[model samples]
Target: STGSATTTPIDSLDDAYITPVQIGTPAQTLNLDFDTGSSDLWVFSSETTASEVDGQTIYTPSKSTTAKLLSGATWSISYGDGSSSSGDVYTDTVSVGGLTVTGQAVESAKKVSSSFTEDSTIDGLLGLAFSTLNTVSPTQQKTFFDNAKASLDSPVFTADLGYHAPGTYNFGFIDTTAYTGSITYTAVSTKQGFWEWTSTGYAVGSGTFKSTSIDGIADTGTTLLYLPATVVSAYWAQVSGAKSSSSVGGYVFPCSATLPSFTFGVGSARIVIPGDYIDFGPISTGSSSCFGGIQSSAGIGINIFGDVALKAAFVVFNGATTPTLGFASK
Candidate 1:
C-alpha cells in the first residue's frame, strides 16, 4: 500500500512542520508536528488538565467508538530542552493520508510542561523514527509508519521538503519526478535508534571537499544543520561579519553578509545547500543581524543533518530488515 501526505511550516517560522492527522473511530482531525527524530505517538488528550491546555485541539477518546483503554501501560518523554510529558496508552484507529492502522498505540496526554501548553500550533507529534524508540511500557509499540509498512507495497518512505513552503511525504514508493539524478544509496547504523549514517566528505560553498568522515543522524524534525566545530567555524570564517556572540544569538552575522553555499558528499554523490537558505531570519524585529542555520555539534556526540540538509535533497528512509538511506539532489 502507498500513502501520501502534505505538510506545512508551522506559524510561518519554517522551523517545525505540521500535518493534519485522523485519529480514533469518528476521525477527529488534529494538526501535529511531523517529527522523525523521536518515536512517541502522543496527542493532547481529554485527561490533560485545562491549565495545561491553551488553544490546542484535544483528543477525547470516549468520543470515539473504536477507542479502548490499554492494560495500564504508561509512557513519558523528555525533549532536548528538558520539556517533558507523560501519559496513559490506548489502542485506536489511526489513519495517515491513504494508509490506515486499525490498532495503533495512541498515547493520551495526562500531564504536560509549559512548553507543550505554549505551542498551540501542534496538538502532538507524529514520530516517523524506528519503533524501538517507542515509549509505551509493554507496548506492541509500533508507530503508524511501522505498522503501516506491513500493508505497504514497499517498506520505504520519501521526504521532499521545500525551502519556505509546504512539502510532501510519500510512502511505499519513490517519486522519480521529485528528484534529479540517481539516488545514492548508503548504509545506516540503526543501532542508535536513529537514521544514523556516515558522510564521505563536505565543503563550504565552492571550496575544496574535505575528505573527513562525519557521523550524523538524518532528522527531518530538527531545524538546523549541526556539524563538527572545525567545519562549522570554517563556514563562518568565510563570512565577513559572522561571529558567535551569545548576547545577540550565538552565530549572528550582518544581514547583508554574502552567505556561501554548502555541499556534502554521499559516496560519489553531492548535494549543495543554497546560500540563501543558511541566512535564517533576523535576530529580532527589524534587527540587522541574522542567525546562521549551521552550528557546532561539538558536545552533542554526533552531528545532525536536520531540515537544512533534508531540504537540499530528496531523502528516502528504506525500512527493510537491513535499513538504508537514499539521497538525491532536487
Candidate 2:
C-alpha cells in the first residue's frame, strides 16, 4: 500500500467489546485487533464448560451455518505476563465490520485464566499486526489486515481507542480529525515481529526535560506505558503530590484537582495523554487524587508504549510497503 490510505469497516461485537469482524457472515458481523505483541484470533467454543467460560461470549458453531472445527490441532498461548490459555482450532466464514470473508482461521480456547479471560466480551483478537509472528499452527491461517488490504479503499489502516465506553478502535483508513498534521515517522528496527522502535522521551505540560534516549516498542494489547525508573520518577516529580498508592499497586493522586496534561514523543509525533488516563480509578468515585502517571516495570527492561499512548494517534504499521511506523491524527 505504501503511503496510500484505505477505509476498512469496524464492528462492535458485544456492548463492552469491539472487534473488526463478525463470526460467520459479511453483513452480520466482524472481528478486529491489530495486536503487535502476538498474532492469533481466538474465540470461546461451544465445547467449553460453562464454569470455565463464565463471562465470556461463547461462539456456537451452530449459531452460524458456516462455522466448522479443525478436528486435529490444539492451541495454547502464554503471554509475557505469565497468563496462558488453551483451545482448539477452527475455520468459519468470518466477517469484518460488514465485509464478509469466508474460510477464515479461528481458535476456540476452552480454558482461560481469571486475569486473562473476560467472557461476554469480544470472543477473539483479529490479529493484523504482522504475519511473521503468527502463533497459528501449520494448517490454520488468516490475517485480517492481509485479507482486507486488497479490498480496503486505502492502503493505510488506523486505530482509534476510546478512553471511556465504546472506546473506538477503527481500522481501514486514518481519520484526520484525530491528528494535527504533526507526525514523525520512525524506521522499524530490524527486530523480530514486534513493532520495536525508539522514543525520544515524554513531557508534561509545557516543560521540556533532557530526552531519555531508549529503545521502545509499541503494543496495543497493553494498557499502560512502562518507563525506566529514572524517567518515571522524573515525571512524577513534576506532578503535584504525585505519589505511589498501595491500593492501585502503581501510583495514585487525588483526582479532584486539575492535573497537567502529559505528552510522549514518538519520533516527531507528540502524543498527549488526557488526565483520565493518568488516574484510571472510575470517575464515579468522588476523589480528586491524581495518580502517578508512570510505573515501574522492574524486571521488564523494554519501555512499552501501550494503549494509553496508542489511543491518542492513528497508528499505521506499514511493514509490507516498507518497514516503517506511520503516525497520524484520528
Candidate 3:
C-alpha cells in the first residue's frame, strides 16, 4: 500500500511544519507535528487541565465509539527545548495521509509544560522515530509509521521539507518529482534510537572546508541547526555584528547583516544551507536584531540538523535492511 501526507508551514511561524492526522472512530482531525526525533503519539485531550488547554483542540475519546482505554498504560515525554507532556493511554484507529492503522496507541495528555500550552496551534505530536524509543508504560507502543510499514510497498518515507512553502512527507513510496539529482546515501546508526549520522566536515561560506567530523541527528522537530560551540563561534565570526544574545536566547546580528552560507559534507556529497536561511528572522516584529538559525548544541550532548538544514535537502528515512539516510537537493 502507498500512502502520503503533505504539510505546509504554519503562517509566519516557520519554526514547525505540521500535518493533519485523524484519531479514533468518528475521525477527530488534529494538526500534529510529525517529529522524527522522538517516538510517541500524544495529543491534548479531555483529561488535560482546563487552564493548560489554552486554545488547542482537544481530542475527546468519549466521542469516539472505537476508543478503548489501555488499562494501565501511560506516557510522558520531554523535548530537548524542555517542553513536556504526560498522559494516560487509549487504543484507537489512527489515520495519516490515506493509510489507516487499527488499535494504535494514542496518548491523551493530562499534563503539559508551558512550552506546549503556550503554542496553542500544536494539538499533538506524531512521532516518526523508531518505535524502540516509545515511552508508553508497562509495554512500548508502536509509531503510526511502524504499524503501517508491514502493509507498505516499501518500508521507507521521504521528507521534502520546505522554507516558507509547503512540503510533502511521502510514506511507503518516494516521489522522484520532488527532488533533483542523485540521492547520496549514508549509513545511520540507530543505537540511540535516532537517525544519527556523521558529517565528514563543514565549511562556512566560500571559505576553506574544515575536516571536523560532527555527530548529529536529523531532527525534524527542531527548528534550528545546532552544532558544537566552537563551530558556532567560528561561523558567526564571519558576520560583522553577530553576538551571543542571552535576551534572544541565541546568536543575534543586525537584520541587514550579510550572512554567509553553511555547508555540511556527507561523505562526498555537500549539502549547503543558504545564507538567508541562517538568518532565521527578526528577533521580534519590526526588530532590527535577528536570531541566527545556527546555535550551539553544548549541553544537549549531540548536534541537531533541524529544519534549517533538512529543508535544504530532500531526505529519505530508509527503513530497509540496515537503516540508512539518503539526501538529494530539492
Best by lDDT: 3
What value of lDDT does candidate 1 attain over all alpha carbons? 0.87
Give the CA lDDT, 0 to 100, for residue 159 in model 3.
89
Every candidate's lDDT:
0.87, 0.61, 0.91
List runs of model 3 lying over 4 Å from the truth.
none
lDDT of 3 at 137: 91
Of 2 and 3, the candidate ranking higher by TM-score: 3
**TM-score ranking from best to worst?**
3, 1, 2
RMSD of 2: 4.6
- Candidate no. 2 TM-score: 0.81
RMSD of 3: 1.2
lDDT of 2 by residue, 1-330 (tens): 222212222322111234545676322342334466666777666766567665655667667777777778677777666766677777787655445456666777777766545434445566655666656665546565666566665644555655543444444555566667755678776456677887777787677745667577777766667777777776676666677666766766665545566677777657777755655553235666544545766578677777667766767666456666777654
lDDT of 3 by residue, 208-228 (tens): 899978999999999999999
Mark the 10 consecutive residues where model 1 has the least summed lDDT.
9-18
lDDT tens digits, residues 269-295, model 1?
999998887878788889998989898
TM-scores for the candidates: 0.96, 0.81, 0.97
